[PDB]
Amino acid sequence: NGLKMFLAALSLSFIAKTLGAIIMKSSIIHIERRFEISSSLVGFIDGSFEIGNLLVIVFVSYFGSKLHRPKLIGIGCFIMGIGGVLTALPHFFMGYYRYSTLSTCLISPEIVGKGCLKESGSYMWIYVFMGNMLRGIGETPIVPLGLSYIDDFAKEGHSSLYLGILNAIAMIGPIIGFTLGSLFSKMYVDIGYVDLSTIRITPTDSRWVGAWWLNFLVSGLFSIISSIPFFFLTGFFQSFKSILTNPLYVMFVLLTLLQVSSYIGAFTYVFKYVEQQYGQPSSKANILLGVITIPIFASGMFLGGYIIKKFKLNTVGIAKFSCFTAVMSLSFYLLYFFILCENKSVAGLTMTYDGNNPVTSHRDVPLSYCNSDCNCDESQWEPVCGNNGITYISPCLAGCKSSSGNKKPIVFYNCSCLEVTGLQNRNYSAHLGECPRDDACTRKFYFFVAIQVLNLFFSALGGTSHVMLIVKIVQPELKSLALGFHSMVIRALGGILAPIYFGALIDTTCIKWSTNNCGTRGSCRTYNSTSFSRVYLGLSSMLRVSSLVLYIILIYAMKKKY
Ligand SMILES: *[C@@H]1O[C@H](CO)[C@@H](O[C@@H]2O[C@H](CO)[C@@H](O)[C@H](O)[C@H]2NC(C)=O)[C@H](O)[C@H]1NC(C)=O
Ligand SMILES: *[C@@H]1O[C@H](CO)[C@@H](O)[C@H](O)[C@H]1NC(C)=O
């Protein structure tokens, strides 16, 4: 086996690391309710893993490479597991979680105090922050160091094949993040301690929390086990300055920073896109997309390793091949622009309550007679779809005199608004929920998903290339640093900032906002279909088009150099 042994543990540590990222995300929403921690802190808690990993990555990489490489990664894994267990710990030392609106037509400081009053000098929130961040350090030596081992110790071109195999087997991590994470979400937090016949809260219930303790246990004990095979297996400034003074490398990391930022933004906002533009709430879509996506992405990465090795591509050749994927992954995006639908008809926001006129400003659409008398709470977002094909903000704002009730039929009757002038024979009724989007888009949505899958395959076929190219354009001794600085740049400036600035441009387009407590903009009830599609796709295509321009310069630069 030889190197294959190291490859075997490296695959195992990749599984552990990737499982670690998804498990925290799965429990991030569940953890807030039981812990009774502030949402702000909840974010700050996620910032913890980031600071761990991001803060020490540029050090572990550079310094670690001189030291024994098969042993250090092992420690990194052992740290990952310890952090996970430690994060599970509060449950061992804490107590049992003791803890309409028909809206038809008619004639936080506490939680914070709860979080703080119970502290009694030291609250449990510090344990989660002190522990999770540990996992970040555990992730630090997996990429910049382990890859620096295989790359330096491998066949002439197999490095590509091995790197493809690792990145295709690490996709089993999510696959095991969604089989147990959802399953263990179903299990109560104090399972085994309390008799589960008395717990009233249900997995669908808001009060119910997910079992964060078992969830981190599965991850910590997996990482600790994964670390067992590894054991058996003034210069800094200058290096950082030297890699940064390399013209080809800086262009390449800038290029990758821009592309990844675009891709990360696209990956995180596809679910708002599935829901807003076409109408799939994404509950069904996420499952369907996930089932198709994981095998196809893994096949894409595997083909990437195989093509590189089989064709015996050199640095310029892989640069070109990478660009080829860059052209193939952007030509597909151009097709998204053609796919856009028209806007959803929302009374009081995009159209008048009588349905006669489009509205230019969603600020202060006057009540129409049909809704003027109703003393309605304008803020409430309880959308009901009328038989006229027009959504209404609430049953009250639709003029619905009566509603069906707590019973299953969702129809609301005698709605003053939406009455079709001239056609009084037909009687009104507004089923709950937003109106479905028109069928042209529904047919189009499948095409959108198909092209998406094609783009994901054609961007995973060049996923292996991103790391493979970096090692070749950097000096044969500062390789570990390279995969560390770059791994920082992908995450610090692009992974951390992707949702923050994509979100902002997207946020401006919202027709309506949710007034959450003091905040009047807590959420967006509905994104304008035309504006959101125009900016989200535009931003993604623009960043990607800039990337192509860099590639051309990058490829021209290597061709001139060689
Ligand atoms: C819609 O409104 C009309 C007019 O208010 C309702 O008409 C009366 O409804 C009750 C029960 O049927 C009774 O007062 C009479 O049988 C109806 N005629 C009138 C005008 O008194 C009607 O029930 C409402 N529901 C609909 C039409 O779906
Ligand atoms: C409305 O009309 C339908 C027939 O189109 C009828 O079945 C239903 O009972 C009516 N409901 C009321 C009370 O308007």
Whichever domain contains 210, its CATH number is: 1.20.1250.20
In Å, what resolution does this model reach? Answer: 3.5
Give the distance, in angstroms, between the CA of residue 347 and the centroid of all CA atoms in the same chain. 32
**Residue in the structure block whose two tokens are 């996709």:** 171
User: Which ligand is closest in space to the CA of residue 415?
Assistant: 1
For 178, residues 6+ apart whose C-beta sits below 8 A from its C-beta are 22, 26, 290
Beta strand segments in 372-496, E: 384-386, 391-392, 400-403, 412-415, 429-432
Contact yes or no for 307/299 (Cβ under 8 A): no
Do 275 and 401 sit in the same domain of this protein?
no
Using alpha carbons, list the distances in angstroms from residue 479 to 14, 52, 143, 146, 423.
19, 22, 11, 11, 75
Which structural domain range is residue 496 located in? Answer: 237-343+438-562
Atom 1 (ligand 1): residue with closest C-alpha? 414
Query: Hey, is 351 helix, strand or coil?
Result: strand
**Upper half-sphere CA count for residue 259 (Cβ side, 13 Å):** 24
Considering 436, 458, 483, which residue would you say is the last residue of a domain?
436
CA distance 66 to 170: 27
Q: Which residues of 421-438 are buried (b: 16+ CB within 10 A; e: fewer)?
A: eeeeeeebbbeeebbebe
Considering 198, 233, 268, which residue would you say is the last residue of a domain?
233
The best mutation among 403, 414, 415, 426 to test binding of ligand 1, ranked by most ligand atoms within 8 Å of the C-beta, falls on: 414
Query: Hey, is 346 helix, strand or coil?
Result: strand
Do 372 and 400 sit in the same domain of this protein?
yes
The H or E element spanning position 524 is: strand 523-527
Pairing of strands 400-403, 412-415: antiparallel
Do 221 and 264 sit in the same domain of this protein?
no
Which ligand 1 atom is at minimum distance from the Cα of 413?
28
Do 46 and 116 sit in the same domain of this protein?
yes
Rounded (5°) CA angle 419-424-428? 50
Ligand 2 centroid – CA 431 distance (Å)? 14
Instruction: Examine residue 285 and state whether it is found in any structural domain, yes or no.
Output: yes
Q: If we measure between CA atoms, which residue out of 379, 408, 407 comes closest to residue 394? A: 379
Do 298 and 357 sit in the same domain of this protein?
no
Q: If we measure between CA atoms, which residue out of 496, 550, 456, 14 comes closest to residue 256? A: 550
3-state helix, strand, coil in the chain (%, to 5): 60, 5, 30
Q: What is the dihedral of CA 473, 253, 463, 28, to 10 degrees?
A: 140
Using alpha carbons, list the distances in angstroms from residue 530 to 337, 428, 538.
11, 30, 12
Contact yes or no for 226/12 (Cβ under 8 A): yes
Ligand 2 centroid – CA 387 distance (Å)? 13
Do 61 and 139 sit in the same domain of this protein?
yes
Atom 2 (ligand 1): residue with closest C-alpha? 414
Q: Which amino acid does the sequence have at 75?
A: I
**Residue in the structure block whose two tokens are 């990607």:** 544
Do 431 and 447 sit in the same domain of this protein?
no
CA distance 278 to 36: 36
Q: Which amino acid does the sequence have at 489?
A: V
Q: Which amino acid does the sequence have at 84?
A: G
CA distance 405 to 518: 31
**Residue in the structure block whose two tokens are 């933004």:** 265
Query: Hey, is 385 helix, strand or coil?
Result: strand
What is the secondary structure of 245-289 as a DSSP string? H-HHHHHHHHHHHHHHHHHHHHHHHHHHHIIIII---SHHHHHHH
User: Which ligand is closest in space to the CA of residue 402?
Assistant: 1
Q: State the greatest distance between any 2 C-alpha atoms of the chain, in Å, as a whole number.
A: 88
Do 362 and 304 sit in the same domain of this protein?
no
Which residues sit with their C-beta closer than 6 Å to ligand 1? 413-414, 427
Do 412 and 493 sit in the same domain of this protein?
no
Contact yes or no for 414/426 (Cβ under 8 A): no
CA distance 439 to 267: 25
Domain count, the chain: 3
Instruction: Examine residue 135 and state whether it is found in any structural domain, yes or no.
Output: yes
Ligand 2 centroid – CA 428 distance (Å)? 9
Q: If we measure between CA atoms, which residue out of 525, 484, 524, 554 comes closest to residue 61? A: 484
Ligand 2 centroid – CA 463 distance (Å)? 59
Contact yes or no for 24/212 (Cβ under 8 A): no
Q: How many CB atoms lie within 10 A of CB 338?
A: 7
Tell me the backbone φ, ψ of residue 309, rounded to 5 degrees: -65, -45
What kind of experiment solved this structure?
cryo-EM
Structure tokens at 181: 């994470």
Ligand 1 centroid – CA 388 distance (Å)? 21
CA distance 252 to 240: 16
Pairing of strands 384-386, 523-527: unpaired
Q: Which amino acid does the sequence have at 297?
A: F
CA distance 255 to 125: 38
Q: How many CB atoms lie within 10 A of CB 244?
A: 12
Do 38 and 57 sit in the same domain of this protein?
yes
Query: Hey, is 415 helix, strand or coil?
Result: strand
CA distance 23 to 216: 7
Considering 436, 455, 471, which residue would you say is the last residue of a domain?
436
Instruction: Examine residue 213 and state whether it is found in any structural domain, yes or no.
Output: yes
Q: In sequence order, what are the beta bridge partners of 385? A: 391, 431
The H or E element spanning position 459 is: helix 439-460
Do 332 and 384 sit in the same domain of this protein?
no
CA distance 315 to 321: 10
CA distance 348 to 120: 49
Tell me the backbone φ, ψ of residue 24, rounded to 5 degrees: -65, -40
Tell me the backbone φ, ψ of residue 284, rounded to 5 degrees: -70, -40
Do 317 and 401 sit in the same domain of this protein?
no
Instruction: Examine residue 155 and state whether it is found in any structural domain, yes or no.
Output: no
Using alpha carbons, list the distances in angstroms from residue 95 to 90, 92, 244, 274, 560.
9, 8, 52, 41, 67
Query: Hey, is 94 helix, strand or coil?
Result: coil
Instruction: Examine residue 391 and state whether it is found in any structural domain, yes or no.
Output: yes
